[PDB]
Amino acid sequence: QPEPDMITIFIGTWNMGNAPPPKKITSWFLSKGQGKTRDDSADYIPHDIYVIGTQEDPLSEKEWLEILKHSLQEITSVTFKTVAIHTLWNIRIVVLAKPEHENRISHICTDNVKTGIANTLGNKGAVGVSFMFNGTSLGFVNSHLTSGSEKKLRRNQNYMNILRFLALGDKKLSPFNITHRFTHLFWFGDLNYRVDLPTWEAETIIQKIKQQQYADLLSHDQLLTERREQKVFLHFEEEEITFAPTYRFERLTRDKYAYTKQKATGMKYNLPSWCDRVLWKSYPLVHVVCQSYGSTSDIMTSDHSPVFATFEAGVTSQFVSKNGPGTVDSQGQIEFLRCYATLKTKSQTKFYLEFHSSCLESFVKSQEGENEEGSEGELVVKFGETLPKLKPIISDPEYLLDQHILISIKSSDSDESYGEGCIALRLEATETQLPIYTPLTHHGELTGHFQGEIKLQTSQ
Ligand SMILES: C[C@@H](c1ccccc1F)N1CCNCC1
Ligand SMILES: C[C@H](c1ccccc1F)N1CCNCC1
Numbered sequence: 291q292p293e294p295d296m297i298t299i300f301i302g303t304w305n306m307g308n309a310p311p312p313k314k315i316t317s318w319f320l321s322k323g324q325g326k327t328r329d330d331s332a333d334y335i336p337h338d339i340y341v342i343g344t345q346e347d348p349l350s351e352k353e354w355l356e357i358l359k360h361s362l363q364e365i366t367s368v369t370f371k372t373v374a375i376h377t378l379w380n381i382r383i384v385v386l387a388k389p390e391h392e393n394r395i396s397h398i399c400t401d402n403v404k405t406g407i408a409n410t411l412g413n414k415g416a417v418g419v420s421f422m423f424n425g426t427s428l429g430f431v432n433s434h435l436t437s438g439s440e441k442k443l444r445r446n447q448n449y450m451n452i453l454r455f456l457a458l459g460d461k462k463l464s465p466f467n468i469t470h471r472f473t474h475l476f477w478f479g480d481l482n483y484r485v486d487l488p489t490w491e492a493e494t495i496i497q498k499i500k501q502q503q504y505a506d507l508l509s510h511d512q513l514l515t516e517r518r519e520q521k522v523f524l525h526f527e528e529e530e531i532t533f534a535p536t537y538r539f540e541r542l543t544r545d546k547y548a549y550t551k552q553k554a555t556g557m558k559y560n561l562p563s564w565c566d567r568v569l570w571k572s573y574p575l576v577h578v579v580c581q582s583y584g585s586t587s588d589i590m591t592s593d594h595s596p597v598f599a600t601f602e603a604g605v606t607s608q609f610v611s612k613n614g615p616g617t618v619d620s621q622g623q624i625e626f627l628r629c630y631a632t633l634k635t636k637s638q639t640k641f642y643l644e645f646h647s648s649c650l651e652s653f654v655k656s657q658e659g660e661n662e663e664g665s666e667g668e669l670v671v672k673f674g675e676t677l678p679k680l681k682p683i684i685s686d687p688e689y690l691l692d693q694h695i696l697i698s699i700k701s702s703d704s705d706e707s708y709g710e711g712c713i714a715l716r717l718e719a720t721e722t723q724l725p726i727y728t729p730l731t732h733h734g735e736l737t738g739h740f741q742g743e744i745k746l747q748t749s750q
Contacts, residue, residue, distance in 0.1 A: 296604060296605065301600070304589075315586075324587060326581075336370075339385065341419070343381075371386065378404065397422045414434050419458070420472060449523065470710050478567060483512035492562075499547070583597075584598055611683075621748075626742050630742065634738055635669055650680060671699065721745065727740070
């Protein structure tokens with residue numbers, strides 16, 4: 291039975307509004323309703339992995355697991371296995387997989403982050419799950435961010451706290467946050483970003499939604515505008531939105547948006563908004579294709595509609611050679627030429643690099659770079675031809691060209707990372723000098739760039 295080179299992943303996010311679900315929720319898992327929907331011809335084809343994020347979830351873990359498993363069983367006639375379940379307050383993540391993936395899934399981690407302080411600590415935050423699927427690392431984050439149209443900067447801060455403090459994936463990747471630890475990272479939830487238009491325009495917005503004319507609404511979506519201004523979710527992707535706003539509905543119908551200020555809302559307006567979102571970040575040149583992104587029309591117990599997204603994702607096999615794992619493959623090497631880091635820092639410490647990759651036995655520390663003053667004020671750290679030669683555990687090009695090198699640039703004085711990035715080994719040529727580039731981030735914000743050339747030698 292061959293190992294797969296692709297899997298499909300279902301991502302669901304649903305703010306349940308503290309109400310039990312209706313008896314039938316299959317439309318969610320089938321990607322049916324509004325937006326980019328799944329073809330009917332696929333209905334009986336199970337996804338490989340289902341990741342369900344809820345917010346304001348009133349059910350016990352046992353109650354929700356039984357509903358989810360019975361739902362998937364009805365759709366597919368497959369009894370899915372529970373990979374992980376983790377709950378913080380009323381924010382929950384469930385990961386289910388085809389039982390045929392029992393010996394492909396390992397290194398399962400869960401964690402949560404509570405956002406806010408004092409007044410604002412006690413119901414918002416995030417849960418997450420990671421695991422390995424054969425040679426591929428997968429991370430999943432369900433976050434419930436701060437509510438309210440005038441709190442976009444709070445949401446952005448909640449995002450930064452979650453990606454700093456959520457402890458998933460390989461702890462040996464010590465300089466790296468969750469935005470670098472996974473081949474594929476999916477981040478979803480009630481992100482709570484709103485359509486920033488004046489309150490007086492509520493009925494105009496409703497009209498536009500009835501016409502399915504979303505362009506003038508999406509141009510004011512706070513998540514899209516904050517992303518475009520690099521304030522949040524830097525280097526994440528989102529499919530185009532082609533479904534109506536998923537909040538705030540009168541319960542038991544989808545015919546009415548309930549937007550007016552009420553004592554129950556803290557006298558706040560809830561203009562129709564795309565609160566409920568799925569974004570992703572995959573390592574460079576790894577296959578990932580969104581195959582659905584939409585909302586259900588027939589699940590009406592909450593003031594939010596469920597959101598679905600599905601993906602094709604590239605995966606690699608757990609490679610064994612005659613040599614690695616447990617030795618090097620002399621026949622392989624990774625060389626770096628004309629390399630320099632450009633950093634936004636005002637500091638003047640010496641810097642060194644660390645190279646981390648599951649194609650290395652352990653991470654590799656470089657010598658210190660040579661600091662120069664860049665012409666527009668920046669710091670340029672030159673490595674030139676000084677970087678170590680990396681010795682992969684396996685030299686087979688079918689393995690090595692699928693790998694990635696994580697890079698951290700660290701202060702010699704504090705051993706703190708000033709920037710993290712990722713280089714793909716999926717090169718156009720081997721034994722050939724080729725340009726490489728990554729942006730560098732720290733705490734998920736841009737701090738610089740790393741560029742140079744690479745020379746990859748495989749067994750072929
Ligand atoms: C242009 C930018 C963007 C697109 C639509 C909305 C917000 C944005 F920031 N992309 C972000 C993801 N990667 C490629 C570039
Ligand atoms: C429970 C879990 C599992 C079973 C089926 C499908 C996926 C999955 F992660 N185990 C992983 C490690 N090996 C034993 C099984």
